[PDB]
What does this fold into?
Amino acid sequence: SLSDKDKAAVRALWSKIGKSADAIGNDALSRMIVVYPQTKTYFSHWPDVTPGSPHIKAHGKKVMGGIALAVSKIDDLKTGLMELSEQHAYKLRVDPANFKILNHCILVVISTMFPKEFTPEAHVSLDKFLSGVALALAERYR
Amino acid sequence: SLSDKDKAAVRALWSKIGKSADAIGNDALSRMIVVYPQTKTYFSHWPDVTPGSPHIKAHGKKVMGGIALAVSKIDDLKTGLMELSEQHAYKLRVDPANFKILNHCILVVISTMFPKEFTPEAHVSLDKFLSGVALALAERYR
Amino acid sequence: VEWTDKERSIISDIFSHMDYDDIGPKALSRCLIVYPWTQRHFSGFGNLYNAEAIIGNANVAAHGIKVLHGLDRGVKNMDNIAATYADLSTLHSEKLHVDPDNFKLLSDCITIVLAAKMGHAFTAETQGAFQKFLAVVVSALGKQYH
Amino acid sequence: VEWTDKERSIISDIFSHMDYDDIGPKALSRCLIVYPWTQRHFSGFGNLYNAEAIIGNANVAAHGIKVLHGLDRGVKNMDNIAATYADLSTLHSEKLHVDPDNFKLLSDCITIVLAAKMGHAFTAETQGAFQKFLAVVVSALGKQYH
Ligand code: HEM
Ligand code: HEM
Ligand code: HEM
Ligand code: HEM
It folds into this structure.
């Protein structure tokens, strides 16, 4: 669980980076569909899950959109993400697998976009943070 | 996170089965290094490492104590388990990936030993509690 | 991978005394409940509201039995596993949209439900063989997800 | 072992431009910082109660490069990586008793440090390529954990 060290660094970073949120999700979501083809499973209904399709694009808004949300609700993500834990559960029944997938892909994007800011230290906290985010989305699974 | 129901689930089950937890931890420990010899990096300090090992008989004892503890702290695993954390995390530098495995084996020794009590309901609840425990055990890592 | 003779042995035995039509449903039933996102791929079933429905559902038994048979091919061709499940992957892939992670889940439950079924005669050594074989099948089963 | 031809080049392009003296230390540093359990094989190398020190610990700089040069040996033998690494793999286990999941964490930190250098060159395609290579070699190094 996040220290105040962690909450401290997560916010600064996203304070630093949070303005690219729409690009980070497109790129990161593109990575996912690309490097981890099995995830395409959740986009079958999508007219075409091509890389960085705008629908993909727009959707990375939403994704990254949920990260900012998680930022502010950082002090407690359980409460914080139950609507998304509801969508991504009873509606989509998304395997918890892919959250860590996405989560890894997000750290890579940010990494590419902000090598100066994404220090090690700002990695472990952002790392630990996404995991709590991963776990709060699981809240409504079972 | 654990529910009122899950908590009842895992306390019912521990009521029926806890009488043989010594018994349960010997084999669950026995099975971990057999089925997953890679975990032997750790207990290779042991004078005896094969199932049959009185060292293994003795330590399995311990692990289910610990799981006796955790059932007693189920409403607050992080706090209940901080001494166990810091040991496995700080001192013993176990890898969190390894908690997943002994629970697997714990999940399987229980089913052999308590088929009729180990409902699918009992299971989904003990399983959440076991990661639940893994999470508490991992508080002291980074 | 390679197989000791014992592994070969242990595995042959397991599937032979196994009661394909009984452990099938049990393990697939148990998966849907413990890992409810795996009810995804079991849409139109009619009554999967609570657990007990799942359990008493015909369209779960089928597949759950379906599944044990499908490993007979892998017990049959221990060393052509990959080729063996080739079309089965693509199936689950491009049509069934089965998440690959779903495979290990079901593996884990077949094991728990069998361990209950086998009691003490589900030795550690038997588990190693059973899980190693199921692994190889799982991997192969997620292999043509492009 | 299947290797498309674009894959080959990518891992070739990548392994051509990459500064083993820079990267390497950086990638072992982050994994010791981001996954502090892996430090159990690099404890007494200096105050590991410190990022800035760890970063700038000699001991750590060095093995990181060994790591990257070590991954080089497999960048040539792209069709027999196992046999390549089997020694190194038989080493890390019996010798230093390393947790082969640790090989997971470090590859990640590599893949993430690498990313920070290529920046916008590190395509999704480039990530896959790079990542599947890392994967493949990883079974190899945990292979003789027995
Ligand atoms: C950081 C974790 C995630 C966040 C913050 C997030 C956020 C969101 C949001 C905000 C929406 C709906 C927005 C709206 O319609 O207003 C959504 C829907 C959706 N998300 Fe995510 N998501 C996450 C993880 C994932 C992952 C890992 C997958 C794929 C494996 C995924 C697949 C979907 C799907 C399938 C939908 C429904 C619509 C569609 O894609 O057709 N989500 N998510
Ligand atoms: C289910 C999660 C776990 C529980 C409840 C648990 C419990 C315990 C307990 C009660 C002790 C006794 C030490 C003491 O307090 O004096 C212990 C020690 C130890 N644990 Fe675990 N443990 C867990 C997971 C693991 C795993 C997965 C590993 C490695 C694969 C591990 C490795 C060790 C080692 C090496 C020791 C020290 C034994 C000695 O004193 O020689 N633990 N653990
Ligand atoms: C050991 C792993 C598995 C094996 C060997 C296996 C095998 C099979 C086979 C051979 C079929 C026949 C095709 C058909 O019924 O149309 C089938 C059907 C199917 N399987 Fe799997 N399966 C496995 C795991 C899964 C999992 C984990 C899921 C999703 C949770 C899944 C979802 C389905 C679905 C939706 C059908 C379609 C049945 C129908 O439409 O009649 N399978 N399975
Ligand atoms: C891609 C994965 C890795 C590769 C290719 C690799 C490669 C190497 C190489 C080339 C050596 C030098 C052998 C020698 O100097 O005798 C070495 C030694 C060593 N490796 Fe790594 N390594 C990897 C990951 C790891 C990890 C994750 C750990 C755990 C922290 C680790 C622990 C060690 C240790 C403790 C040594 C001993 C150094 C010595 O005494 O020379 N390795 N490895």
